Design a protein around this nucleic acid. Structure first.
Ligand SMILES: [K+]
Ligand SMILES: [K+]
Ligand SMILES: [K+]
Ligand SMILES: [Mg+2]
Ligand SMILES: [Mg+2]
Length: 136
RNA sequence: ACAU
DNA sequence: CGATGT
């Protein structure tokens, strides 16, 4: 089982969980940063991992790329497959933004098609995903 | 247990 | 040590 180097890797970063959430996508081979989301003041790790995958799908579709996406998040991979982010985060004024983005990401999934493989990055074999924030 |  | 999730 080998790394598919012609791929996009994504990952969340946070200050607290729940806390300030951001995410980014990088070229797995080179580490080049292809997109970075502006920090969101309150979210969860899994909401961020979900948004990162969906952004990756939208990024690749816009560019007519068939590359797969790596994610280290078992949860977010499942949520994307299901087209449903099963977060426990309370909905209130301070979580409104992240929930708006999660709702809109789900909506995008429900109105678009893709063949992009969404693959588990095997951290136990390969070390940290290339999109990692180096904060742990 | 597993993944974050 | 704590949290988010299956
Ligand atoms: K990190
Ligand atoms: K990890
Ligand atoms: K647990
Ligand atoms: Mg991750
Ligand atoms: Mg990481």
């Amino acid at each position: 089982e080998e790394i598919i180097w012609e791929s996009l890797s994504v990952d969340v970063g946070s200050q607290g969980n729940p806390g300030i959430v951001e995410y980014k996508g990088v070229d797995t081979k080179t580490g080049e940063v292809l997109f970075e989301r502006e920090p969101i003041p309150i979210g969860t790790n899994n909401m961020g991992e979900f948004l990162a995958i969906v952004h990756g799908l939208r990024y690749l579709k816009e560019r007519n790329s068939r590359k797969p996406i790596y994610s280290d998040s078992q949860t977010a991979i499942k949520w994307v497959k299901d087209k449903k982010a099963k977060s426990t985060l309370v909905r209130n004024e301070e979580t409104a933004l992240i929930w708006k983005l999660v709702d809109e990401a789900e909506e995008w999934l429900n109105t678009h098609t893709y063949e992009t493989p969404i693959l588990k990055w095997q951290t136990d074999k390969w070390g940290e995903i290339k999109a990692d924030y180096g904060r742990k």
